[PDB]
Amino acid sequence: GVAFKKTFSYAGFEMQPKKYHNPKIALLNVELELKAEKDNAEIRVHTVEDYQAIVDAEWNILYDKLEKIHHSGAKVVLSKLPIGDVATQYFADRDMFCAGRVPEE
Amino acid sequence: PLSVFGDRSTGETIRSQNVMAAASIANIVKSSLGPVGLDKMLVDDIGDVTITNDGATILKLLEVEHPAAKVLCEL
Amino acid sequence: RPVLVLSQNTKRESGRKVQSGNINAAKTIADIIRTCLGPKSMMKMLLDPMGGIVMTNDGNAILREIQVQHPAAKSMIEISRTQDEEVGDGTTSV
Amino acid sequence: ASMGTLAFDEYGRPFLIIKDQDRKSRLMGLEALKSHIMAAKAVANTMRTSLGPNGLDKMMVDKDGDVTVTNDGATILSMMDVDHQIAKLMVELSKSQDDEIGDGTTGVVVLAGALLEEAEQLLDRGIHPIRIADGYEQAARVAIEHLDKISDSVLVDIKDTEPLIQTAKTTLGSKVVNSCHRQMAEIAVNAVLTVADMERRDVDFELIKVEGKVGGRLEDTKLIKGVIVDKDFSHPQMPKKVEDAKIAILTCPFEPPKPKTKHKLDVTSVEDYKALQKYEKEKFEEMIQQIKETGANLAICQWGFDDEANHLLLQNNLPAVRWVGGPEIELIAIATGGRIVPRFSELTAEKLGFAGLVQEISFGTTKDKMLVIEQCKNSRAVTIFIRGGNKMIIEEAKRSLHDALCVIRNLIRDNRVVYGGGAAEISCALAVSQEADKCPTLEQYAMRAFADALEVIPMALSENSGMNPIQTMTEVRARQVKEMNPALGIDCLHKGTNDMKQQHVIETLIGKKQQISLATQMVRMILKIDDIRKP
Amino acid sequence: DGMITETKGTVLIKTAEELMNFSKGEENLMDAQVKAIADTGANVVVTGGKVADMALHYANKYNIMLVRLNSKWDLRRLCKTVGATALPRLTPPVLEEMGHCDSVYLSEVGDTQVVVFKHEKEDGAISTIVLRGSTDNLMDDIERAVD
Amino acid sequence: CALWDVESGQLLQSFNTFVSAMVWDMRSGQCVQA
Amino acid sequence: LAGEGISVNTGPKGVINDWRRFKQLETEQREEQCREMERLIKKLSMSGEGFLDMI
Amino acid sequence: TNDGATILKQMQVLHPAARMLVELSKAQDIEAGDGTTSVVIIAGSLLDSCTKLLQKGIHPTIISESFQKALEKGIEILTDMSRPVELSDRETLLNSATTSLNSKVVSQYSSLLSPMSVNAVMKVIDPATATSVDLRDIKIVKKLGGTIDDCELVEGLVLTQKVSNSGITRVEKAKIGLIQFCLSAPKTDMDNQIVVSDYAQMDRVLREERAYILNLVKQIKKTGCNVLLIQKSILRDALSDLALHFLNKMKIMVIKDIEREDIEFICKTIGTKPVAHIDQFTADMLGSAELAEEVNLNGSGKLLKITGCASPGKTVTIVVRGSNKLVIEEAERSIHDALCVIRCLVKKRALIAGGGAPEIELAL
Amino acid sequence: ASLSLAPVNIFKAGADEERAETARLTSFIGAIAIGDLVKSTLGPKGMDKILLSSGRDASLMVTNDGATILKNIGVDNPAAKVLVDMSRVQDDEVGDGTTSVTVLAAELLREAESLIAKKIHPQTIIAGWREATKAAREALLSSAVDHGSDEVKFRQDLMNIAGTTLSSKLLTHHKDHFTKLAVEAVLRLKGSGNLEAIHIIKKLGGSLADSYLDEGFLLDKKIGVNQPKRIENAKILIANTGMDTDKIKIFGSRVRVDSTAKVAEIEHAEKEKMKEKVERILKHGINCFINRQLIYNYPEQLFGAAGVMAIEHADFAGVERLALVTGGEIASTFDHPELVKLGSCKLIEEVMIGEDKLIHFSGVALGEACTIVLRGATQQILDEAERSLHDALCVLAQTVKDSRTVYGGGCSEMLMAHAVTQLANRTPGKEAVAMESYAKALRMLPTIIADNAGYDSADLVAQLRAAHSEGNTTAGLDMREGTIGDMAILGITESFQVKRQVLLSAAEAAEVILRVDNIIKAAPRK
Ligand SMILES: Nc1ncnc2c1ncn2[C@@H]1O[C@H](COP(=O)(O)OP(=O)(O)O)[C@@H](O)[C@H]1O
Ligand SMILES: Nc1ncnc2c1ncn2[C@@H]1O[C@H](COP(=O)(O)OP(=O)(O)O)[C@@H](O)[C@H]1O
Ligand SMILES: Nc1ncnc2c1ncn2[C@@H]1O[C@H](COP(=O)(O)OP(=O)(O)O)[C@@H](O)[C@H]1O
Ligand SMILES: [Mg+2]
Ligand SMILES: [Mg+2]
Ligand SMILES: [Mg+2]
Ligand SMILES: [Mg+2]
Known part of the structure; x- marks a missing residue:
């Protein structure tokens, strides 16, 4: 099969189970963490309601990606790009294993 | 471990060095053998010029450092 | 601490280069006094290292005052001296 | 015997082959073997004095002047500033033994040194080093099989921990904590057993936190069935002691939300400014109300918070701590049985951890505080809190406890043990000698040299205890041959008996097998090398 | 990759819906472009610039072989050999600009991984001589002889 | 290191977050994360 | 600071x-x-190896 | 300098005993202000005697205990010799000031500096109640030029800042007011920008800025104020050119760049309550004064003097003048010594004779 | 063959190592040098030291504290580093005993050197020392006397402990006054161990006897401009709010308008927000207001117009001390005035100390926070007085925490050594010799005590040993006249915790150092 070293787990990783008996593996190239939508993106609002809507929209984007991964049926998640602590805790809540920054090979 | 104030060569290294020195001494004078041989010019550090074909004279005039080369010159 | 067969200040060269160099040295020595032959020869001024001046067109006199490093030129100088001593004439010609 | 080879051709022309060949060195064959064997012998002889209960410590000083007193062979060799390549190989061997096992990092070095010392006298008699390596490998296989044969199994049940305590005591006997020996062994055994996957699976050392604080005494070292954190309550006026605390672990700073994307908010009129101020105040009140509505008693954050949140937390009878580290947050979540929540809106009652007692600990006249969480329901994470009269013994106790935890972990992985004190290696030497008498004569010398090298550790133990090495080792070997008992070793502590089974000197079989294997492989490599090309 | 403005690109977001839908719309546009390219039958794509992650993913989804040629001279020579035209944008190619090669594959020669655009007919604008050997200097000498 | 108020010109405090690594926090004066 | x-x-x-x-x-x-000291100071007030081994 | 504390501090002594003696002199200056030279000599003589005492074979602890006993007896003797003094007696205060000034360079000027120092101390304290004197309430201004005979005691406030107005240098019946905000274009603490999208918006911005400045100046003027002191400001222009022109048009003297640490002194001197927002700027905040003029020191500089106040509350200013820097510095030090002597007399109402009499009597 | 004494070289350039005899020699020399340096500053007749810094600052420090002396020295010998760290840890744990523990460790290592010279394996010495430490600890615990139940007896014990702690330091000149000062300061803590609540203010000038403990609290901050300088029956509100261009926490917010009139309106809105915050603060009904952070000119003017004192930039320690002394709550929000407790005091006024003005809080409500004014003749005197008071306060706080006390003046050392000798007299082998050396070092401690005073240490120690062997368990050195006497009658007592910590730390450090037989040094950076 394949074996590789553990790659800088974030907080809440030790709360994930470390053994599965028939897992489905989600091989991804995705950065699963809160971040700017784009490097050149700029948000212009003039209302506190829009401010709250924007922060909730960022959280909803992250949670929608995680929810899609969860209902994909996979139990093990691997990604080239970093997997943030929020995603790590989300996967721990659902009893899944996650590992970010996995080497390409 | 030996603690001898000097350099030491043992085995193939020293044998190869001796053979190389002897071969160099040979190649020095190999060009002055037989009627088709040609003479050589020896120039001192003060400008004195010596032209000769005799091997013994050539080996006497040269400065020789390796002991095997000294052996060949004295031979 | 280098190991050597000959001395570290001994230089050797051989082959076509040696013959070409010797012949070129002889040619240049001849060229030095080439124009000093015949009834229409010209004088040459030689500055002696001891401060003297030698003004002549004799081949041996001109060649004797020249200091050369290439041994072939030394051989040519000795040839001129031998010709001068044996008969006293024909140094430039020889 | 140096400066490579210098020829400068037989025609007088320059002869340059390797760049900077005049500034490089080279050793060929037997001289290189002798130099390597001498270097390994020097390293092993330096290490062998620190072997056994009577072994003495080494005082290591780094390049910055920091000084460390230790008995661990891997720790000594790691800090040693060597330049010989074989010394670096020996250091790497000790580090490998530490990584794989955690104990016996000094035995491997001594065994390898003895093996190479015997290989030197074999080489002097005209034996190819490859033959020596092959004989050593054969003898190592024989010794490993004998160790498996004479091994004994112990119970690794939680209900009865006496064999585990005995093994941890045997590991800790050589260390400075032998004053609190039994308490330290009990602490290590309980720490390993509390956090361990029961189905013979791995033991995660990351769930064992080993933190030491100066002051107190060595006997004050205790095992906390929870998490101890060097932080303290944010507001100085909140209570220092919370009982039946409902922990609320959060990773959101108690500040108004901030989009990650580059954003600008535009204030275009006075009413906009009033709306912004009201929004900020209501956000603070709302986060505090959301925290309070879950019924939590203590709230733990990771990224800190500002003055308004602090005063609202104090005003609502909600003790809180800020700037708790990520690993500490994870440990608290694991121990208290509560989940990690990323924002207030997702905080519910079912995600709250439980702690029997959360207390703030003072440390005398030092102004430094430290928070402790314990009395959890089924805490799966434990922490060891070490006290001492100076930081140096604190570090030594840290590494000694690490050795004990590693030994108990090895017992978890495999329950077979052998009796130490040199008894196991004496029996292995006897088995190797018996096997050599049957093999052809040519490998007999290598196998007997292997047996002699195996017999050095009992000799080192006897010498460190002051007894005569050769006489004691010969008597013990004769007793082992006469009465069939591979448990007879070297009475280092002068207890009056040579039977290690009664003395309860117990070693893991995995440790001895790894020692022998690693020493054999490193000796094989060192024997195989016959050329050095240092610059 | 999706082309961008040459002046300056700044994504302006004023509502939550735009922030929610921007990445989805960009990914859908990339998928549509890649599928439109594939629908013409182009099963091999050669590009002179970098390859985006989403573009590569959608190319892999539609079974499209990707080769990247940094040198512009190599791109021109490949266009001459196959018979295609280097499109300036990412629009799907019309039948005249669609090059054809009888076999394109990834192969390893010696200890080197190479991509081969092999014709079967004894024709083509460009022919390549592959040189083997044991020394770089000897192979350079053979190249000089071939020149 | 010390923090100075530009306007008033008075020494605020000597050591919302700054890092020298070693990060601090002037909202509490603690050394926070190492 | 002893010994x-x-x-x-x-x-x-x-x-x-x-x-x-x-x-x-x-x-x-x-x-x-x-x-070299035989020249300087002694009389001034009032390759090198080649020179050395020639003297 | 003749000051012992200054002499010890200036030279960088290296021996630890010398450093301790320097600290001793500094402590004596702090507690008393005079005798900084005598105390060091006393300590040196004590240790010189300790040399002979140690040579005889006496443990240092016994020496220290005996010295403590001698110190207690000496305090008793010194208290016995001294006589009570009353702060209402000007002659004793003048004699103390003259004695303090006898050893300094300003000894021929004692007839001028002794009454000046006595008046300066007595004007900043309540004689019937005060048990100590805060010397920070006596400001000393050092201006070059002239001679030490030109030292003058200002009952009001002296400012080294120059008037920004041109042509307005003397105001009578002044109404002084401190300003702690900026008279310039509006600028919020938040990040603020003005966005222009139409051509008319530019002239609208100019007109509205002018109107805002004019309204600020009109609000300032409507209170009857005619002399304005503006606190020093950074990160915002304290005094705009338009604001200065508007203030000049209304005949108001303007002084800017007032130091932050001098606000309390000015408020105590001229009775002006500082104002930080134009909303609260009213007539009651102003401090009335008889005259506020800028004087010229015969080409050696300009000083703004505000003499005569309706509420002259316990504050005086002393202007020290002289030929060169060294003499004015030493005159300042000597005047400070005289003020410290009067402060000591205020703290402890006891007077003792001088000229070595206490030392001789104590030795006997 | 040795690692360094071999034909092959195994080290980098500059790396060194010392084998058994050399390592033991170096460690013993370093330990003995450290012990001899720290000693002679021990006991009531100990002398002080001068520490000159070699740096550019060239700070001058005169001290008697052993930990202070050992901290500010550049020690190269690693054993010296071990002793220095042991003394520092002893100082951290308890305020006293640094010199005692260092000297005990040095004497133990000297005895170990003698035993090694007598051809005794160091493991035997270590085992004997462990047995001796166990016996001495048991005897010292058995001799402890507790007076926590009684009140006047506990007060007398506190007096005696403070006097004994201050006896060695420079404060012994006014020992009685300073002992009363320290015990009052500690008793004002109401049993809290927070020594940060006791503030020491060093003011130059005046006599050392002029030092005093303020009946209230003293603050070294300044009041506003227009605010009153004296308030009676003050109602205190302690806060940790902005009061200085307080900006909304939304850092992405900005002002973007199309005219300057809107900018002026936003300026007025900001000023109105600050005014509303000040009004909310004033709604608590207060006379004084202490804020941890700065207070700019607008809130200061508002407070002055309201007739309310506004003390600004009172740091975390300052606000904590004010809360402890007045009972107020450090509030950062003012939307619930009824849920915030207000401090109280009879009077607030400015005081004139030396040439500096301070704010005086008189008639405080709680008073669980002390300020101590130190007047001295030199900066070194002030620093030494501060360190001595710190030692006394630390020991008094430890005694309050644990009321068990033991007799000083060498009595505890004599009793522990007598127990060790009794144990050694019944033990066969060289462990008896090791335990006898342990007892010899314990005897050497009060021997150094007597030597520092110039008395005949040998005769006094012999008399003490005879008295302790006879059964006089309270016999001790009497430094008043140079004889021996009853420590219970003379009132020379010490904290049991301090003595136990000294014994255990010294034994532990000696055991750690004795186990070393090889010192390997890496190549330094320089
Ligand atoms: N009580 C004892 N009696 C006899 N031998 C012991 C005893 N305890 C430990 N030993 C021996 O001392 C040797 C050294 O152990 P230790 O120093 O703890 O680790 P390492 O093997 O890394 O040196 C072990 O091989 C063990 O057999
Ligand atoms: N006119 C005077 N006649 C006699 N003695 C004087 C006279 N003026 C001052 N002294 C004495 O000179 C001593 C030194 O005073 P001074 O130099 O002014 O300050 P300090 O005491 O700091 O040296 C004083 O003790 C004083 O008694
Ligand atoms: N008045 C006293 N009489 C006799 N011995 C004293 C007296 N005061 C202190 N000592 C002794 O001096 C020793 C050292 O105390 P000290 O020097 O004050 O602090 P440290 O313990 O840090 O050295 C104590 O062990 C104590 O027994
Ligand atoms: Mg002629
Ligand atoms: Mg071990
Ligand atoms: Mg004077
Ligand atoms: Mg003390």
């Missing part, structure tokens, strides 16, 4: 190679220094 009686003991005999090499180099400089 003024160092008694280096085995040291000088164990590192005698470098000590003797430095001694030889210093003595080699010493003949040159002695040769």
